Short mmCIF file of N, CA and C in Angstrom, two decimals:
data_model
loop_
_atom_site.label_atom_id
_atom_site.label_comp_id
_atom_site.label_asym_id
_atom_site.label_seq_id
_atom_site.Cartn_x
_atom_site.Cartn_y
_atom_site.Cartn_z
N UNK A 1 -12.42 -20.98 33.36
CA UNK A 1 -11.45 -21.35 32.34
C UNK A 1 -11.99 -22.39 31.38
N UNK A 2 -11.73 -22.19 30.21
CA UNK A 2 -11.69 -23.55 29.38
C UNK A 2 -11.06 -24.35 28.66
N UNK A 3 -9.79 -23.67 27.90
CA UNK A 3 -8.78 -24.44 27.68
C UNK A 3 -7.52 -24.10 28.64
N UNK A 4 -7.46 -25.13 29.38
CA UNK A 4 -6.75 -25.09 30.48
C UNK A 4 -4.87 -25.66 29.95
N UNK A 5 -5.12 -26.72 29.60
CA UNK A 5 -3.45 -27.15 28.79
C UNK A 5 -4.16 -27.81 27.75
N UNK A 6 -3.64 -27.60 26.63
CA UNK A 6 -4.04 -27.86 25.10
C UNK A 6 -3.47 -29.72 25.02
N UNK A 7 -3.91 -30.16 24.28
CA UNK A 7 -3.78 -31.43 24.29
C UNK A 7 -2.78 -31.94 22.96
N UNK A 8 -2.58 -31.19 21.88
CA UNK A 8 -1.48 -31.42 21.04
C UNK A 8 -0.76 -29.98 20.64
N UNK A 9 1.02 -30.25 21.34
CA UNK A 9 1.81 -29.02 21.38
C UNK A 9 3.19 -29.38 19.77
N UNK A 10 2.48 -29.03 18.88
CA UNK A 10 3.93 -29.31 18.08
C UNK A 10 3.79 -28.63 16.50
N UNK A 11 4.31 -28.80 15.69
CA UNK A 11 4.21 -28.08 14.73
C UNK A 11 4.73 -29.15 13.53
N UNK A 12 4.45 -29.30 12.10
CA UNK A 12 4.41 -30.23 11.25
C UNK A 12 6.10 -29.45 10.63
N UNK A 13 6.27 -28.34 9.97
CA UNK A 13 7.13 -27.67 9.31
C UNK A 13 7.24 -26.20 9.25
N UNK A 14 7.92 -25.72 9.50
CA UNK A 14 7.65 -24.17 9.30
C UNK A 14 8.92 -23.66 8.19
N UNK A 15 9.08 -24.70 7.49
CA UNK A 15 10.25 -23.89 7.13
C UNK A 15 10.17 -23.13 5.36
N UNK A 16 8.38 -22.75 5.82
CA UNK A 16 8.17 -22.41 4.57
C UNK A 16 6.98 -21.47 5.29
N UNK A 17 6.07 -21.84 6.34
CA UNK A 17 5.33 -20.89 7.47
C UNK A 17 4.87 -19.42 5.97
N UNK A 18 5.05 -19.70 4.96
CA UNK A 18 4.43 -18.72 3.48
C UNK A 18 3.14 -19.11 2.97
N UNK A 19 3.07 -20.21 3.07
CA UNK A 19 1.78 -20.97 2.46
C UNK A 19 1.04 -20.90 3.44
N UNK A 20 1.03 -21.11 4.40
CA UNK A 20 0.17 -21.27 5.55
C UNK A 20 -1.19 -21.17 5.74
N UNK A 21 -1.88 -21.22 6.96
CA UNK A 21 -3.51 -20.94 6.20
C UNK A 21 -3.77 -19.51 7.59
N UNK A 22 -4.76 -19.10 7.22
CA UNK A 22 -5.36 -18.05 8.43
C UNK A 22 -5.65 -18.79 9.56
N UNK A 23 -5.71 -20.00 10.05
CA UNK A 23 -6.67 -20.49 10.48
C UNK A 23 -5.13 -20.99 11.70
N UNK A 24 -3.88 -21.36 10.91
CA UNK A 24 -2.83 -21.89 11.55
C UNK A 24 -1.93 -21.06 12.30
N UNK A 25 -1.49 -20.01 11.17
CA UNK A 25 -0.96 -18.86 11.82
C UNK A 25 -1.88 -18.18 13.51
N UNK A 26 -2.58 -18.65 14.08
CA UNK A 26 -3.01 -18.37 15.05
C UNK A 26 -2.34 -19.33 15.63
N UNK A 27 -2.68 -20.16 15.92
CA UNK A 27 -2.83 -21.30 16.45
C UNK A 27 -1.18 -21.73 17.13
N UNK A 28 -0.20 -21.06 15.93
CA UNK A 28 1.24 -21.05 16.22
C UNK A 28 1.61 -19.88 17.39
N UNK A 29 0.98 -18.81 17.28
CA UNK A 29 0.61 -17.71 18.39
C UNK A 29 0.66 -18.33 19.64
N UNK A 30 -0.69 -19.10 19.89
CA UNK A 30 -0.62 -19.02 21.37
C UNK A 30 0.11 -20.11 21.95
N UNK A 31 0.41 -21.27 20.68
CA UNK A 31 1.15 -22.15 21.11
C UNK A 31 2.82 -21.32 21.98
N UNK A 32 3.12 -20.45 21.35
CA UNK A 32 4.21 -19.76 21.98
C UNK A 32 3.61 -18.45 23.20
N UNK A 33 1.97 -18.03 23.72
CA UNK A 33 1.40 -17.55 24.10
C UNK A 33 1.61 -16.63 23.96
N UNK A 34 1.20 -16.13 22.52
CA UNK A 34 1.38 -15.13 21.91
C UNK A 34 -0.44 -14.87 21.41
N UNK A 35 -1.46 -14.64 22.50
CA UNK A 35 -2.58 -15.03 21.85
C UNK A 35 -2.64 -13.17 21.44
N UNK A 36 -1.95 -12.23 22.32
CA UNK A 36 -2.20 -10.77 21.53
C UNK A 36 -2.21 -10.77 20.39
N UNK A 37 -1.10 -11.67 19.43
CA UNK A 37 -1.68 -10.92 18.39
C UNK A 37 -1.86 -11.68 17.27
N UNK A 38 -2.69 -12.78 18.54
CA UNK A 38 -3.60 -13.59 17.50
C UNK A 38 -5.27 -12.57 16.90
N UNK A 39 -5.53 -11.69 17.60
CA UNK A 39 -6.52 -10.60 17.19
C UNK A 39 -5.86 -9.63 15.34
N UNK A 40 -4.90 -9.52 15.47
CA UNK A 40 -4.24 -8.60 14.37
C UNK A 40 -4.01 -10.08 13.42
N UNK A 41 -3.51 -11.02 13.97
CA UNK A 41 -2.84 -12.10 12.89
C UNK A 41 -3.68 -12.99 12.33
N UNK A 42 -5.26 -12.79 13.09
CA UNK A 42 -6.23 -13.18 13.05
C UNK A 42 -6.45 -13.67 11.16
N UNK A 43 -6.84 -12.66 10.33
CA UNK A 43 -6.71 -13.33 9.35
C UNK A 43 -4.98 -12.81 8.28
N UNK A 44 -3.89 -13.32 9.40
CA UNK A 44 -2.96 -13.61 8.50
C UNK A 44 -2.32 -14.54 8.29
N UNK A 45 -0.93 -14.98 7.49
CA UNK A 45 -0.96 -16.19 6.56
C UNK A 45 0.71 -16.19 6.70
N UNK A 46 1.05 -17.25 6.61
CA UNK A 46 2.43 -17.44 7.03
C UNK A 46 3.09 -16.52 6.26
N UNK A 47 2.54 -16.24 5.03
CA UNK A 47 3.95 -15.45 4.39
C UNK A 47 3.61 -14.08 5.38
N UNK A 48 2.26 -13.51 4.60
CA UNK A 48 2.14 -12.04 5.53
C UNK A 48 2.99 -12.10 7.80
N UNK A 49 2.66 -13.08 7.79
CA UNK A 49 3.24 -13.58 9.35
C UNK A 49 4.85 -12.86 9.56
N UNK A 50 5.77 -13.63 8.25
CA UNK A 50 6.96 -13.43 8.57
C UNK A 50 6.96 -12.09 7.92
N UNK A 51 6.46 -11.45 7.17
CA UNK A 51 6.52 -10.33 6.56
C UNK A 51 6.48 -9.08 7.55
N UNK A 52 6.58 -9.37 8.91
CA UNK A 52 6.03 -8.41 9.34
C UNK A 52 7.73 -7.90 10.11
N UNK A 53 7.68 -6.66 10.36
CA UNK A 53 8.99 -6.32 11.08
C UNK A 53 8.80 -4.91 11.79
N UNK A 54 9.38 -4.59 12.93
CA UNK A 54 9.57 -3.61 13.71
C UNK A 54 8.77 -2.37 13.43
N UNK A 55 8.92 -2.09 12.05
CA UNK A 55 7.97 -1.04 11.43
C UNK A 55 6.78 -1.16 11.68
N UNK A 56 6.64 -2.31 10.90
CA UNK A 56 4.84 -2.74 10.74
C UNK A 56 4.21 -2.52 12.43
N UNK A 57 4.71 -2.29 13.09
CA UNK A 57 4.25 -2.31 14.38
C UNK A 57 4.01 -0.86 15.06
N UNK A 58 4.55 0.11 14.49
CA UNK A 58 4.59 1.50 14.43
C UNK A 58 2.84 1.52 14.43
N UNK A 59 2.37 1.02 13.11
CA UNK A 59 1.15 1.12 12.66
C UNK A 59 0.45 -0.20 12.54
N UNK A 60 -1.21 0.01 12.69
CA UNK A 60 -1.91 -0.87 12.94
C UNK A 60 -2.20 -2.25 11.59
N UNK A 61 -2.01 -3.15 11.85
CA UNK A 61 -2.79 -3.45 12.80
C UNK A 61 -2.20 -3.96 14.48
N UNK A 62 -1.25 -4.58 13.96
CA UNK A 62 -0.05 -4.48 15.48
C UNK A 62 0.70 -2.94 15.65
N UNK A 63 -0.10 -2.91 17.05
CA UNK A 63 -0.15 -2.11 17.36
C UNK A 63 0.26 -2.21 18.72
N UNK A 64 1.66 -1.45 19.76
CA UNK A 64 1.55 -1.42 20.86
C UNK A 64 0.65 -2.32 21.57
N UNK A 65 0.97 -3.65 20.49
CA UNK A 65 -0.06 -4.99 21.49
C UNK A 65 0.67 -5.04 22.49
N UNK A 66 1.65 -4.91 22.99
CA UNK A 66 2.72 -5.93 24.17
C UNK A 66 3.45 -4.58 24.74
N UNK A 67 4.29 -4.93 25.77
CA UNK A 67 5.24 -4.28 26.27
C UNK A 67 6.60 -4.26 26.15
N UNK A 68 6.70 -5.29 25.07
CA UNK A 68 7.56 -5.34 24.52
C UNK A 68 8.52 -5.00 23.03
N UNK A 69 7.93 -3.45 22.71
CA UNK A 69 8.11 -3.13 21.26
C UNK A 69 8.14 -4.18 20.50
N UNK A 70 6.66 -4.93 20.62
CA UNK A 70 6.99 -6.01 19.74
C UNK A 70 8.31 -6.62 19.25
N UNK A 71 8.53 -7.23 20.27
CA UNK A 71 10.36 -7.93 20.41
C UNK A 71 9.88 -9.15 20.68
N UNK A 72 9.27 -9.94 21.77
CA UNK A 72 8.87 -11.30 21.58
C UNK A 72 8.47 -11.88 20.51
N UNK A 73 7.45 -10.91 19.80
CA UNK A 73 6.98 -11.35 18.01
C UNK A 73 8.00 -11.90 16.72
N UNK A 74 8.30 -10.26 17.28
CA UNK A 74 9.56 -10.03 16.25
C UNK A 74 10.99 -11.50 16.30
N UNK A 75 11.24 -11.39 17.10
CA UNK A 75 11.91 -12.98 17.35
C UNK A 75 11.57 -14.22 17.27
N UNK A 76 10.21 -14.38 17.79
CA UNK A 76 9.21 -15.78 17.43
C UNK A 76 9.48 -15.68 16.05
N UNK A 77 9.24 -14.69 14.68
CA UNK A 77 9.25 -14.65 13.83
C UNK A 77 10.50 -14.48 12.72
N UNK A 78 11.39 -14.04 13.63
CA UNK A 78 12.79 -14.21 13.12
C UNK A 78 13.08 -15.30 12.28
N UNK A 79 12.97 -16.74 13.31
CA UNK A 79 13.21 -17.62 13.11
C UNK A 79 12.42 -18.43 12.06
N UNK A 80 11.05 -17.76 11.86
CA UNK A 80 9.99 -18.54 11.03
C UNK A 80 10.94 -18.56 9.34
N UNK A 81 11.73 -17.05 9.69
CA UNK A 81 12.60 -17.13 8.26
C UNK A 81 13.50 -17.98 8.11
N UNK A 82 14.62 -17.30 9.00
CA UNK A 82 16.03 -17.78 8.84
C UNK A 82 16.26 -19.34 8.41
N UNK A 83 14.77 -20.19 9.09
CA UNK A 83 14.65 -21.49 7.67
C UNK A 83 14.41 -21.28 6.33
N UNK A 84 13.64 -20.48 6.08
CA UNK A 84 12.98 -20.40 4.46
C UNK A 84 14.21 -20.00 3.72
N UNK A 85 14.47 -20.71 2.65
CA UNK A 85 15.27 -19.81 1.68
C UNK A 85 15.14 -18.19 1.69
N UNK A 86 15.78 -16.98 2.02
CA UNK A 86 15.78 -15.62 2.14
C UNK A 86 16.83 -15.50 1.52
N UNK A 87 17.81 -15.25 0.58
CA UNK A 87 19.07 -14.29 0.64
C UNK A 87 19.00 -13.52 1.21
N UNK A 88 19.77 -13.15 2.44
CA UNK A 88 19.74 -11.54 2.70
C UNK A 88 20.70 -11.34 2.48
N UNK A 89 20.87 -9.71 2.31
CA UNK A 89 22.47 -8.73 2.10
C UNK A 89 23.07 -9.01 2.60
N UNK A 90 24.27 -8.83 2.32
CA UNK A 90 25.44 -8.77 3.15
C UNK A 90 26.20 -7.45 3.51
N UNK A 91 26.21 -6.85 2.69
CA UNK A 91 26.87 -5.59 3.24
C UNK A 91 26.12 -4.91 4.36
N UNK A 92 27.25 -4.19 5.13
CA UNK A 92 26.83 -3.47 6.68
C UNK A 92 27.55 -2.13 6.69
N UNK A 93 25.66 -1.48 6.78
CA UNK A 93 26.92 -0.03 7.10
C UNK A 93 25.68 0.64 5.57
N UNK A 94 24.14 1.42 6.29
CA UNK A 94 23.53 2.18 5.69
C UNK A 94 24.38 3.59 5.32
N UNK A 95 23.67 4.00 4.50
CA UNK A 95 24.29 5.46 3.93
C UNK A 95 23.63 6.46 5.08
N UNK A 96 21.79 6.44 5.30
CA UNK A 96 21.41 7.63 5.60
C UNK A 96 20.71 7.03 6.85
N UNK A 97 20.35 7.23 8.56
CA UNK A 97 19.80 6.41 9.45
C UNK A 97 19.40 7.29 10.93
#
């Protein structure tokens, strides 16, 4: 083994996790031990990070990383939004599904 327990566990702001660098967006991964898909997230960037959803996982580069239809991700990342300014819709209730 070599990193056995990491020596600083915390995070400065995420409530923007858009700007981010390639280098951080990992690093937020395994802090939640999420190192799968620190390989795919490898060079991605807070915005591309939260950009990602259920779909994107259909196809590569996340890909059937987990056993979890990418649902642990998908939730770690939920939240990376629901700070950032997003409007989302409001209306409920698609036409075609």
């Amino acid at each position: 083994g070599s990193s056995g327990s990491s020596g600083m566990l915390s995070a400065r702001t995420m409530k923007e996790v858009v700007y981010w660098s390639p280098k951080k967006v990992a690093d937020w991964l395994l802090e939640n031990a999420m190192p799968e898909y620190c390989e795919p997230l490898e060079h991605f960037t807070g915005q591309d990070l939260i950009n990602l959803t259920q779909e994107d996982f259909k196809k590569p580069p996340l890909y059937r990383v987990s056993s979890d239809n990418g649902q642990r991700l998908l939730d770690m990342i939920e939240t990376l939004k629901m700070e950032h300014h997003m409007e989302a819709h409001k209306n409920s209730g698609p036409s075609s599904g």
